[PDB]
Amino acid sequence: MRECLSIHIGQAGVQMGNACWELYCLEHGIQRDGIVSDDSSFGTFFSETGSGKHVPRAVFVDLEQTVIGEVRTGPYRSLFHPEQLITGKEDAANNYARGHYTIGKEIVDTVMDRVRKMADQCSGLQGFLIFHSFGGGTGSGFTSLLMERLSVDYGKKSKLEFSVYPAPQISTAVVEPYNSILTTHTTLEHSDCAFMVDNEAIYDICNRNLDIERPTYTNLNRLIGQIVSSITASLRFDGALNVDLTEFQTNLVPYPRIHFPLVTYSPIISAEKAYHEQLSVPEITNACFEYSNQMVKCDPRRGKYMACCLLYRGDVVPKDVNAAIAAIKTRRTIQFVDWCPTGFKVGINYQPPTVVPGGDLAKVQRAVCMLSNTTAIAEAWARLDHKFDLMYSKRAFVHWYVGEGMEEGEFSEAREDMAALEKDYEEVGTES
Amino acid sequence: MRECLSIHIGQAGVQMGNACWELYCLEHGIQRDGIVSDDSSFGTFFSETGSGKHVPRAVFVDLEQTVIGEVRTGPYRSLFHPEQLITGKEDAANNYARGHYTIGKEIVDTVMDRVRKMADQCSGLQGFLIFHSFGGGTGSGFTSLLMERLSVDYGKKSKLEFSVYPAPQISTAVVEPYNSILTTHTTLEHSDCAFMVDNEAIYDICNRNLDIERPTYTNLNRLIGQIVSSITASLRFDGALNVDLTEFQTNLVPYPRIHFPLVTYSPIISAEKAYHEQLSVPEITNACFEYSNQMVKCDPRRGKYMACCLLYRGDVVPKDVNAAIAAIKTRRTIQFVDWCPTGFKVGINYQPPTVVPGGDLAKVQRAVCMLSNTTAIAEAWARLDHKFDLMYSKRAFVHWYVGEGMEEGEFSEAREDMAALEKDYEEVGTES
Amino acid sequence: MREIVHLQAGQCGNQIGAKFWEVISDEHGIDPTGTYHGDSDLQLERINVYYNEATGGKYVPRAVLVDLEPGTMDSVRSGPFGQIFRPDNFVFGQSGAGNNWAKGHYTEGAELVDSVLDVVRKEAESCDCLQGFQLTHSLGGGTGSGMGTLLISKIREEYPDRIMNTFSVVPSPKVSDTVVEPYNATLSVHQLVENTDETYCIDNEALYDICFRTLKLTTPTYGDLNHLVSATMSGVTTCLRFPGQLNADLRKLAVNMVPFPRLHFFMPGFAPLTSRGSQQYRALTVPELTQQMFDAKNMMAACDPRHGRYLTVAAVFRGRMSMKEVDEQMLNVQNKNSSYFVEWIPNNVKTAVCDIPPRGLKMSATFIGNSTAIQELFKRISEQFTAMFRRKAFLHWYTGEGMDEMEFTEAESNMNDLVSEYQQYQDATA
Amino acid sequence: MREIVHLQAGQCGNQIGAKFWEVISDEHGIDPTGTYHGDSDLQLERINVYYNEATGGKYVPRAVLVDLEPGTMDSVRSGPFGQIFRPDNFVFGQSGAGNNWAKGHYTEGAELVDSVLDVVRKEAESCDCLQGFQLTHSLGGGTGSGMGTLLISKIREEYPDRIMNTFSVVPSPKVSDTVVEPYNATLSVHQLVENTDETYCIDNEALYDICFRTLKLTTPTYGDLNHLVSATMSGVTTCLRFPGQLNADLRKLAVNMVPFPRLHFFMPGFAPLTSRGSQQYRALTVPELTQQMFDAKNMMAACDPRHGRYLTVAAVFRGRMSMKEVDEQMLNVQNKNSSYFVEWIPNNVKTAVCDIPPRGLKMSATFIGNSTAIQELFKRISEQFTAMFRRKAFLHWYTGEGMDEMEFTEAESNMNDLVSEYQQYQDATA
Numbered sequence A, B: 001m002r003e004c005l006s007i008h009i010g011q012a013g014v015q016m017g018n019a020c021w022e023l024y025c026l027e028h029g030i031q032r033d034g035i036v037s038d039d040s041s042f043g044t045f046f047s048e049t050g051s052g053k054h055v056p057r058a059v060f061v062d063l064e065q066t067v068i069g070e071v072r073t074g075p076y077r078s079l080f081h082p083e084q085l086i087t088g089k090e091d092a093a094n095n096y097a098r099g100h101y102t103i104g105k106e107i108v109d110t111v112m113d114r115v116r117k118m119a120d121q122c123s124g125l126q127g128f129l130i131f132h133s134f135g136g137g138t139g140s141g142f143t144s145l146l147m148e149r150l151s152v153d154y155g156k157k158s159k160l161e162f163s164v165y166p167a168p169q170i171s172t173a174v175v176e177p178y179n180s181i182l183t184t185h186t187t188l189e190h191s192d193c194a195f196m197v198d199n200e201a202i203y204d205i206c207n208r209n210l211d212i213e214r215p216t217y218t219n220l221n222r223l224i225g226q227i228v229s230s231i232t233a234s235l236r237f238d239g240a241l242n243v244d245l246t247e248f249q250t251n252l253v254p255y256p257r258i259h260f261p262l263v264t265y266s267p268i269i270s271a272e273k274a275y276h277e278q279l280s281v282p283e284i285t286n287a288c289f290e291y292s293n294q295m296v297k298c299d300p301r302r303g304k305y306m307a308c309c310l311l312y313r314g315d316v317v318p319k320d321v322n323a324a325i326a327a328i329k330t331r332r333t334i335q336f337v338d339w340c341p342t343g344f345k346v347g348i349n350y351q352p353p354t355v356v357p358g359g360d361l362a363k364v365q366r367a368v369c370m371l372s373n374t375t376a377i378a379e380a381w382a383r384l385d386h387k388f389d390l391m392y393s394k395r396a397f398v399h400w401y402v403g404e405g406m407e408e409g410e411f412s413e414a415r416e417d418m419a420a421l422e423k424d425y426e427e428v429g430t431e432s
Numbered sequence C, D: 001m002r003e004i005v006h007l008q009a010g011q012c013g014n015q016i017g018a019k020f021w022e023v024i025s026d027e028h029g030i031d032p033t034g035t036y037h038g039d040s041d042l043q044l045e046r047i048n049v050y051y052n053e054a055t056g057g058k059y060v061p062r063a064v065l066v067d068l069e070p071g072t073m074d075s076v077r078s079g080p081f082g083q084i085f086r087p088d089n090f091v092f093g094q095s096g097a098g099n100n101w102a103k104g105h106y107t108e109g110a111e112l113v114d115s116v117l118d119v120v121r122k123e124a125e126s127c128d129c130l131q132g133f134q135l136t137h138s139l140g141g142g143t144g145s146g147m148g149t150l151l152i153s154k155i156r157e158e159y160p161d162r163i164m165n166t167f168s169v170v171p172s173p174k175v176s177d178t179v180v181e182p183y184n185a186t187l188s189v190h191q192l193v194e195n196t197d198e199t200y201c202i203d204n205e206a207l208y209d210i211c212f213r214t215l216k217l218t219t220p221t222y223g224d225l226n227h228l229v230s231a232t233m234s235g236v237t238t239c240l241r242f243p244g245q246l247n248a249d250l251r252k253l254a255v256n257m258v259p260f261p262r263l264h265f266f267m268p269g270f271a272p273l274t275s276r277g278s279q280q281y282r283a284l285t286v287p288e289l290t291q292q293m294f295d296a297k298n299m300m301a302a303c304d305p306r307h308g309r310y311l312t313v314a315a316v317f318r319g320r321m322s323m324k325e326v327d328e329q330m331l332n333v334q335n336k337n338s339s340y341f342v343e344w345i346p347n348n349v350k351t352a353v354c355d356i357p358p359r360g361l362k363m364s365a366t367f368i369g370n371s372t373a374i375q376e377l378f379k380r381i382s383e384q385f386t387a388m389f390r391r392k393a394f395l396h397w398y399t400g401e402g403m404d405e406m407e408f409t410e411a412e413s414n415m416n417d418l419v420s421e422y423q424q425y426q427d428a429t430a
């Protein structure tokens, strides 16, 4: 498949990006200096300079120099194009209004210029990849600007985004409920399907599945990088049942306003513990449908699955996949909504996951990534909305947003839009 | 035959398990590190990793880290799957209520999850093996939980359990009469046939038959391991008159509430004393029906035999077995209940017992294990019940059980259930 | 892992504590400076039971030392193992108690109790699974009696589910050390008779006898009696720290030893106890230890066990052992001492074995006995409290501190009930 | 790059400033002569945050030192880091204030304020992106209170968009240092309650307690308390200068900490704070730091936090760290301290982590708390201002300088509104 474009906005997105491109360079054998030295389809994410060099096709953006400064001084400094590392002067300070109205407006024009140049060199553009934090100043306000600009300027193209959905129990900021809803209202229409991941859920995986007692954001991004790699494996390798970028939205978006699938990955085992498990297709296939293995704290058993995409990767046999999927569908504890008799979208690629040196993930020749648009996320939305209205009833932090060029009316409109989204899940969750 | 599952609960069961799996590894030539290096039917008790390694199909469970910690630090540490060694935080403290209501409930869910995964890899499951102490906190309270869970979740499958029946004279704990009856009431319905063994009886064998003056629990487990090995010899080797796992309950359970056979083994001779005995089939066959050789202190002559299973092992000749059995049936001192004209269930396997290095048992090419459901155990039940009512008449230790979530009514109900069991033996012990 | 926090109050409390960590540290090979020098990995496998590890190759024993005057604690700091404890755990007052239960409970100790519980709470929070508490004190003492009971009530209220052990020195019958012991003991028993799960009664009179004849020690001192006491206290928790064929933790002993909630007073024992001259002429084997531990002369309690009966006995062995021998001797004791055990309890022995023995011995055993003979001990105190309180011999000191005379009579009655309940169960069904 | 300009006024202002650049220069490895001697390139990557580079291998801290008498500034010149500052920034008067807010604001400071702003304007023009201002002073002081408020109003008028931090020493409740503190504080709060975005209240009484018990310092001095204060002040801007997994700048803290515009008074904290003797017996890990920072005894404010509730808490960590551990402990604090946080704010913790720790420590954390307990502090001042002003105890000094008695009553009312607004939000929706 042809080119796919990547965008990294905010500290979470930027830090995820360097982990994602660490895998991409390792998978294609590209050195950290931008020269290939160990699969010719790497042009999907890289542009050849014409002099034995490859420039990653990403646009790292932030309103502060700190996070991008690390990239400029890191090992991958020579990799990225200098102009792609667009940076501002002052951070959004966790305020949505700043990243969307005041300071975001000053730097949005420069971002589009680079994005336009990236498109000019495209013989074919499947879509965009946008990495951001669902709750945060730059990752919620500036992303909405790009979504509006990209949709109107380009349109008719897939727009995949990865979001750090706020964990129900764990939270590292105070005004996240305000920030998450504001971006959801503005990004719901211009998005195609946003993959959601929690920090708490990955921590639990790193503690139960993996034997790591000292995890860090660096570990999480490395465990999130393979999620992105598997999703784009078809565009970069060959295998039966190829899944193009645009196929994800068609299969996983029954309705335009329900495009928030969750992410699961398997196997996830340490080097020592791998010796004691066969890791056959049924084992990993069953693991993907375990509450203990999903990367979103919402309980899958609390709702019903509407659509599921199984991107099998490695030395897998299609017959085993069909038998394994049949076993899942006959389970009574698992339940799929009646109006969708067929929910599984299988994808097989002949490229086992690459081993990241120094990582906490063991070498496996057979891995699978599951994307499931499940109604269980409706409970998470209600809890997030419950936080918002409780704060907004007293104007806990509204004055900061008001002074940054955002009218108080948007809070009411945004929550009502969220309320309708809750009703939409309720409507599709029952059948006669 | 296909897979059989093993469960080890409590200190007695866990310590027995490491002895049982020492024999299993030696019999099949599996090294203590989980790699075969000296009979391909070893899959009954082992699962192949697919990379030249074998994982024993057992689930070691306890509420304390001490006993399982020894296994994790022992030579067989690399053998067992790390997740199979399920352990709690605080021991049941010899209280049935703790192991069944308070602390047992917290860890029961995790145990079932592993048990479910073991079943998923089964092309055929004959039943379960549960090792526990008939009297003890974890070995009586937690086993009842598993029996209830396994029966309802799986059902329609054999459930064999080995129990350390409290010795009449020797006793290492004070509240055993309370503990033994409570588990008997809850495990009578969900069990198929529980093999019973005493510590005093094995000590007497180690002193009279063997020439060991310094026995230990380690010696007893080694002498109990061959009991389990012989019972499962048919499932792991070939020979005339194969005895499947489900055949034991059909032959040895005339009535649903009488499934408590006792265990006997022969020959049991030291290395030096073996040179002076021929050890022909009649000699070992007659030895199995000797009060001095049975592993339960109850006198066999004090009652009548109802059913008997003779699992001959080694280079035995079927003609000799038939003649030897005929000699037993014509004895007048031995008496079988009238309503069962046929009581002997013969089983022959072509695999002599393996020699355990450093053991107190001599090498014999011809061994036999006898399982006899005899009414003589009724006397033992009455003595155990006699201890219970004497204590319960004054509430000697009831307050500990009451405060651990167990109602006082269960004591009355459990004893009445035991009283009915005594009557059941009386009813089947006479004929017109 | 199962974990415990040790509390020591009063002069006897701290000194026995000091001679207790001098022995626990020896078993685990912990240097006085706190660094580990043990020769076996099996010692560190369960070090966390009594110690909270501090990064840097050192371990700190989670112990709380309480004393109203600083005299006893200052000496501990100057001891060989004084620097081992965390300085913050050393909590003390300024006005020491005048051997009056009132001052150590109501007036002086009330102000310092808040400080003590805060350290205790931090130690509990430092654990992953707290199993119980241990308190060392002396009933005749004022600080221990008064402050020990106050601490027991507070921690019990705060941690009702957790166990709590008490190794209490009990007044001797013949020679005393404080005039007003009868008042302190009765007041303290009134609190321990409902707040603690198991108590171990020790008397120096009995320990003096052991040294004189059993051990032929010409010039013993409290530096020596405490060593014997520490041996038994360490033995009770051998299972929590080292492996064995038949492990018995604190709770297991409590269930096997406490038939009724109020009858949780035991008399400890130890074996072998032989002099240096007698070491040649004795064989250290199971048959000999069993006789020594059930011998009335080896008991750490003044009351003669033969004057009563055993409700429950618990034997904790250590070292290389043979289970059948252990079973045989206990059976022999059951049959030989026919009238020494109650009929309404068919089995009276709870056996425990550990692989590792203590110090240089190749075999050890610890004796715990819930014998009915201890009624003669409270009865004697019951007579010594009545004779004094009959005419208010020393009550004007307790009254001046706030205690009302009514509390005194309730404790006497609560003491008479305990003796009556012991005599009640000494009967036979037939 | 984000940049800041530091202002120090009054005796407490300058001295804390002096003990602040003695620490910022240490983190960046800046020699007292101004030349860089750091061992890591990561220190110069963000040096410009506090320093304006001067060609020649030297750096000059853009700081403005204001004082009406030259006594306090003359000592700074003679200090180890006195020659580091630009001589032109040393702006001072001749007639020092007599601890009267009027003289430092209306009469004496009015003439010198023009001079101060000119240097401030040049420093701002020397920057590429000015982020905010920092002021160090003391509310009880006259120069700081009076001149500090005058400067804050002028710079706020000149730079409304920019932030401004204030580390104000607040009068202690028990022992004071100036007789007329109630007048100075109320007048100064009347200005800071509308002009500054975040203020950090510090009291020497609380700092004295920390040294006595938390740090076991027998003879502390202001050379030591200022070091503790400088640690917190440096910690607040760790993110502007060094990288981390979760960066939080001044503005990010302000939005996460200031729910309502007038409720911008915080109580700082720091951890670990252990004596030299206690260094052996403590493990420097995340679980221990979280308890210490939320401990009422580690607070740099006299008011007990437990008497109130937390609207917002911000934790700034430093050093090698584990995110999950940080998340765990904050969750435990949220659940354990159930009633210590308001219900109308589901999330109360704002976490920040930096890679580099301070000085030789391998781990540090800074605590910022917008707790409602601070109402008891203004209430006490509210009672001490009323009692004096009730009969004009010392008003004839302020009146003589031009201040009218009407301004006094408005500030009292504006102070009562602040306490009422704090009590208003201490309520619960259900």
Ligand SMILES: Nc1nc2c(ncn2[C@@H]2O[C@H](COP(=O)(O)OP(=O)(O)OP(=O)(O)O)[C@@H](O)[C@H]2O)c(=O)[nH]1
Pocket: A009, A010, A011, A012, A013, A015, A016, A063, A091, A092, A093, A094, A095, A132, A133, A135, A136, A137, A138, A139, A164, A171, A172, A173, A199, A217, A218, A220, A221, D245, D246, D247
């Ligand atoms: N998984 C993961 N999440 C991160 C990482 N870094 C930050 N986050 C998340 O980002 C959320 C807050 O938004 P940030 O991305 O940190 O802030 P930002 O995007 O830089 O926008 P600003 O408000 O201007 O700082 C936190 O709740 C984190 O969960 C990371 O490295 N990995």
Ligand SMILES: Nc1nc2c(ncn2[C@@H]2O[C@H](COP(=O)(O)OP(=O)(O)OP(=O)(O)O)[C@@H](O)[C@H]2O)c(=O)[nH]1
Pocket: B009, B010, B011, B012, B013, B015, B016, B063, B091, B092, B093, B094, B095, B099, B132, B133, B135, B136, B137, B138, B139, B140, B164, B171, B172, B173, B199, B217, B218, B220, B221, C245, C246
């Ligand atoms: N034959 C044999 N019996 C044992 C062994 N270990 C313990 N027992 C028996 O177990 C009985 C007591 O119950 P245990 O199994 O020890 O206790 P448990 O199963 O761990 O349950 P808890 O009360 O929670 O400790 C004793 O009377 C012993 O006879 C062993 O290794 N071999």
Ligand SMILES: Nc1nc2c(ncn2[C@@H]2O[C@H](COP(=O)(O)OP(=O)(O)O)[C@@H](O)[C@H]2O)c(=O)[nH]1
Pocket: C009, C010, C011, C012, C013, C015, C016, C097, C099, C138, C140, C141, C142, C143, C144, C145, C169, C171, C176, C177, C178, C204, C222, C223, C225, C226, C229
């Ligand atoms: N075993 C032992 N007992 C002691 C020691 N010192 C004091 N005692 C006992 O403590 C009792 C006196 O109580 P004490 O604790 O000194 O009073 P307190 O200071 O108010 O708690 C006496 O009966 C002694 O038997 C000691 O070092 N070892």
Ligand SMILES: Nc1nc2c(ncn2[C@@H]2O[C@H](COP(=O)(O)OP(=O)(O)O)[C@@H](O)[C@H]2O)c(=O)[nH]1
Pocket: D009, D010, D011, D012, D013, D015, D016, D097, D099, D137, D138, D140, D141, D142, D143, D144, D145, D169, D171, D176, D177, D178, D203, D204, D222, D223, D225, D226
């Ligand atoms: N924390 C701290 N406070 C101080 C220090 N020096 C003075 N103060 C405080 O400053 C107050 C006096 O005001 P001051 O600033 O000296 O008057 P000014 O010179 O006119 O500004 C007193 O209440 C002290 O508490 C110091 O070194 N550290």
Ligand SMILES: [Mg+2]
Pocket: A010, A011, A064, A091, A092, A138, D247
């Ligand atoms: Mg940022």
Ligand SMILES: [Mg+2]
Pocket: B010, B011, B064, B091, B092, B093, B137, B138
């Ligand atoms: Mg146990």
